[PDB]
Amino acid sequence: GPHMIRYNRDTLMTARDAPIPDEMLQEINRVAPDILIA
C-alpha cells in the first residue's frame, strides 16, 4: 500500500487561498453561528 500522506508547513501555507463550500457554511451557521465569518 501507499505511504502516509504528509504536508509540511511550507506546503500547507502555499496552498492557503474565496467562498467556503455551501455545506460547510450551512453547518457552521446551524450549530455555531457566532464563530462564522463569511
Binding site: 502516509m4 500522506i5 504528509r6 504536508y7 509540511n8 508547513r9 506546503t11 500547507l12 501555507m13 496552498a15 492557503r16 487561498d17 474565496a18 467556503i20 463550500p21 460547510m24 457554511l25 453547518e27 457552521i28 450549530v31 455555531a32 457566532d34 464563530i35 462564522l36 465569518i37 463569511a38
Partner: protein, 173 residues
C-alpha cells in the same frame, strides 16, 4: 485542485454557558479531510484569540469525542502549553498545521486531537494523545510540539494524565 489529508478531522466548539453541564456546551461544527477545506474552515471562523472568555475549540480525529470519557482518550493525556493574542493564534494554527499535515513522524496514530481554551487566567493550548503509559511516544510528540510552535526551552511543558485531570505532571519538557 484537491489535496487529501491522511485523516478526517472534526472541529468542535464550546461556548460557555453557566446553566449547562460541560458536555452540553460542546458542539461538533464541521468535518474536513482536504487541505482546501482545512483552510476554508480556518479562514472563515473566529480566530482563537477572538473567542470570548470560557470558549474552546477542539480539533479531533473523526470518531473521537473530545472528552476524557471517550474510549480513545480514557487511557490518554495531554501536553499542555500555557499562554500568559497573536502568540495564541500562532500556537493554535501551528499546532493545527502540524496535526493535519501528519508531522508527528511515526506516532500519528497516537494523536487524538488539539484543544485551545480561552481564559482570563491564561489561555491554554493542548495536544491530546492516546496512551499516557507510553513515555517514549509522548516525549517524542512533545519535542515536535515545542519545535513546531517555537516554544522556548525555558517554558517547561507538562504532560498531564486525563484520569488525574478527571479526579501532577507525568512528564515535563
Amino acid at each position: 485542485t484537491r489535496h487529501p489529508l491522511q485523516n478526517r478531522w472534526a472541529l468542535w466548539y464550546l461556548k460557555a454557558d453557566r446553566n449547562k453541564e460541560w458536555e452540553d456546551c460542546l458542539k461538533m461544527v464541521s468535518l474536513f479531510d482536504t487541505v482546501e477545506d482545512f483552510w476554508s474552515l480556518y479562514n472563515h471562523i473566529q480566530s482563537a484569540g477572538g473567542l470570548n472568555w470560557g470558549s474552546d475549540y477542539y480539533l479531533f480525529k473523526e470518531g473521537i469525542k473530545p472528552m476524557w470519557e471517550d474510549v480513545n482518550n480514557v487511557q490518554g493525556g495531554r501536553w499542555l502549553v500555557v499562554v500568559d493574542t497573536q502568540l495564541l493564534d500562532h500556537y493554535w494554527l501551528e499546532l493545527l498545521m502540524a496535526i493535519v499535515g501528519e508531522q508527528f513522524d511515526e506516532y500519528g496514530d497516537y494523536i487524538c486531537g488539539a484543544v485551545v481554551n480561552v481564559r482570563q487566567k491564561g489561555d491554554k493550548v493542548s495536544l491530546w494523545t492516546r496512551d499516557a503509559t507510553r513515555d517514549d511516544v509522548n516525549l517524542r510528540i512533545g519535542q515536535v510540539l515545542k519545535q513546531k510552535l517555537s516554544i522556548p526551552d525555558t517554558e517547561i511543558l507538562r504532560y498531564e494524565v486525563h484520569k488525574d485531570s478527571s479526579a501532577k505532571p507525568r512528564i515535563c519538557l
